[PDB]
Amino acid sequence: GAMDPQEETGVRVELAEEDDGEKIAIKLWLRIEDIKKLKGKYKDNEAIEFSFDLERDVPEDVAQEMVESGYVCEGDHKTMAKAIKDRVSLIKRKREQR
């Protein structure tokens, strides 16, 4: 994890709630950290809420939806999906503990 205040990733995904169970489908908000790192129309005060099925939904799939639905530019698809996958990774990681 990033302990140093660098945060090079211009995106970050947080939970809309506090996941602590086994719910397969959660609700995340794609928070845009730095819109200058991106290549489209964004705002340095926006967060895109999206529900994520940890089994059925795919990070890069959701980021495509983000592009098509007019939230994200296709040029930042990988960036957004990486944000999504980054969160889902730690989410599933926390769930690896009993």
Coordinates of N, CA and C in Angstrom, one line a residue, residues 21-80:
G21 N -19.2 -8.2 5.3 CA -19.9 -9.4 5.3 C -19.4 -10.4 4.2
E22 N -20.3 -10.8 3.3 CA -20.1 -11.7 2.3 C -20.8 -11.4 1.0
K23 N -21.5 -10.2 1.1 CA -22.2 -9.7 -0.1 C -21.4 -9.7 -1.4
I24 N -22.0 -10.4 -2.4 CA -21.3 -10.6 -3.6 C -21.4 -9.3 -4.4
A25 N -22.4 -8.5 -4.2 CA -22.6 -7.3 -4.9 C -22.5 -6.1 -4.0
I26 N -21.6 -5.2 -4.2 CA -21.4 -4.0 -3.4 C -21.7 -2.7 -4.2
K27 N -21.5 -1.6 -3.5 CA -21.7 -0.3 -4.2 C -20.5 0.6 -3.9
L28 N -19.8 0.9 -5.0 CA -18.6 1.7 -5.0 C -18.8 3.1 -5.6
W29 N -17.9 4.0 -5.2 CA -17.9 5.3 -5.8 C -16.5 5.6 -6.4
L30 N -16.5 5.7 -7.7 CA -15.2 6.1 -8.4 C -14.9 7.5 -8.2
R31 N -14.0 7.8 -7.3 CA -13.6 9.1 -7.0 C -12.4 9.5 -7.8
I32 N -12.5 10.6 -8.5 CA -11.5 11.1 -9.4 C -10.5 11.9 -8.6
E33 N -9.3 11.4 -8.5 CA -8.2 12.1 -7.7 C -7.6 13.2 -8.4
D34 N -7.2 13.0 -9.7 CA -6.6 14.0 -10.5 C -7.0 14.0 -11.9
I35 N -7.9 14.9 -12.3 CA -8.4 15.0 -13.6 C -7.4 15.4 -14.7
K36 N -6.3 15.9 -14.3 CA -5.2 16.3 -15.2 C -4.4 15.1 -15.6
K37 N -4.5 14.0 -14.9 CA -3.9 12.8 -15.3 C -4.7 12.1 -16.3
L38 N -6.0 12.5 -16.5 CA -6.9 11.9 -17.4 C -7.0 12.7 -18.7
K39 N -7.7 12.1 -19.7 CA -7.8 12.7 -21.0 C -9.2 12.8 -21.4
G40 N -10.0 13.6 -20.7 CA -11.4 13.8 -21.1 C -12.1 14.9 -20.3
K41 N -13.4 14.8 -20.2 CA -14.1 15.8 -19.4 C -14.4 15.3 -18.0
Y42 N -13.7 15.8 -17.0 CA -13.9 15.4 -15.7 C -13.9 16.6 -14.7
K43 N -14.2 16.3 -13.5 CA -14.2 17.4 -12.5 C -13.5 16.9 -11.2
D44 N -12.7 17.9 -10.6 CA -11.9 17.5 -9.4 C -12.7 17.6 -8.2
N45 N -14.0 17.1 -8.3 CA -14.9 17.1 -7.2 C -16.1 16.2 -7.5
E46 N -15.8 15.1 -8.2 CA -16.8 14.2 -8.7 C -16.5 12.8 -8.2
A47 N -17.5 12.0 -8.1 CA -17.4 10.6 -7.7 C -18.6 9.8 -8.4
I48 N -18.2 8.8 -9.1 CA -19.2 8.0 -9.8 C -19.6 6.7 -9.1
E49 N -20.8 6.7 -8.5 CA -21.3 5.5 -7.8 C -21.6 4.4 -8.8
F50 N -21.1 3.2 -8.6 CA -21.4 2.1 -9.4 C -21.5 0.8 -8.5
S51 N -22.4 -0.1 -8.7 CA -22.5 -1.3 -8.0 C -21.6 -2.4 -8.6
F52 N -20.9 -3.2 -7.8 CA -20.0 -4.1 -8.3 C -20.3 -5.5 -7.8
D53 N -20.7 -6.4 -8.7 CA -20.8 -7.8 -8.3 C -19.4 -8.4 -8.4
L54 N -18.9 -8.8 -7.3 CA -17.5 -9.3 -7.1 C -17.3 -10.6 -7.9
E55 N -18.3 -11.3 -8.3 CA -18.2 -12.5 -9.1 C -18.6 -12.3 -10.5
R56 N -19.7 -11.6 -10.7 CA -20.3 -11.4 -12.0 C -19.7 -10.2 -12.8
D57 N -19.5 -9.1 -12.0 CA -19.0 -7.8 -12.7 C -17.5 -7.8 -12.8
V58 N -17.1 -7.2 -13.9 CA -15.6 -7.1 -14.2 C -15.2 -5.6 -14.2
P59 N -14.1 -5.3 -13.6 CA -13.6 -3.9 -13.4 C -13.6 -3.2 -14.8
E60 N -12.9 -3.8 -15.8 CA -12.8 -3.2 -17.1 C -14.1 -3.2 -17.8
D61 N -15.0 -4.1 -17.5 CA -16.3 -4.1 -18.1 C -17.1 -2.8 -17.6
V62 N -17.0 -2.6 -16.3 CA -17.7 -1.4 -15.7 C -17.2 -0.1 -16.3
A63 N -15.8 -0.1 -16.5 CA -15.2 1.1 -17.0 C -15.6 1.4 -18.4
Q64 N -16.0 0.3 -19.2 CA -16.6 0.5 -20.5 C -17.9 1.2 -20.4
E65 N -18.7 0.7 -19.5 CA -20.0 1.3 -19.2 C -19.9 2.7 -18.8
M66 N -18.9 3.0 -18.0 CA -18.5 4.4 -17.6 C -18.3 5.3 -18.8
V67 N -17.6 4.7 -19.8 CA -17.3 5.4 -21.0 C -18.6 5.7 -21.8
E68 N -19.3 4.6 -22.1 CA -20.5 4.7 -22.9 C -21.6 5.5 -22.3
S69 N -21.8 5.4 -21.0 CA -22.8 6.1 -20.3 C -22.5 7.6 -20.1
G70 N -21.3 8.0 -20.6 CA -20.9 9.4 -20.6 C -20.3 9.9 -19.2
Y71 N -19.6 9.0 -18.5 CA -19.0 9.3 -17.3 C -17.5 9.4 -17.5
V72 N -16.9 8.5 -18.3 CA -15.5 8.4 -18.5 C -15.2 8.5 -20.0
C73 N -14.0 9.0 -20.3 CA -13.5 9.0 -21.6 C -12.7 7.6 -21.9
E74 N -12.9 7.1 -23.1 CA -12.4 5.8 -23.4 C -10.9 5.8 -23.3
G75 N -10.3 6.9 -23.4 CA -8.8 7.1 -23.2 C -8.3 6.8 -21.8
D76 N -9.3 6.8 -20.9 CA -8.9 6.6 -19.5 C -9.6 5.3 -18.9
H77 N -10.0 4.5 -19.9 CA -10.7 3.2 -19.5 C -9.8 2.4 -18.6
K78 N -8.6 2.2 -18.9 CA -7.7 1.3 -18.1 C -7.4 2.0 -16.8
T79 N -7.3 3.3 -16.8 CA -7.1 4.0 -15.5 C -8.2 3.8 -14.6
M80 N -9.4 3.9 -15.1 CA -10.6 3.8 -14.3 C -10.8 2.4 -13.8

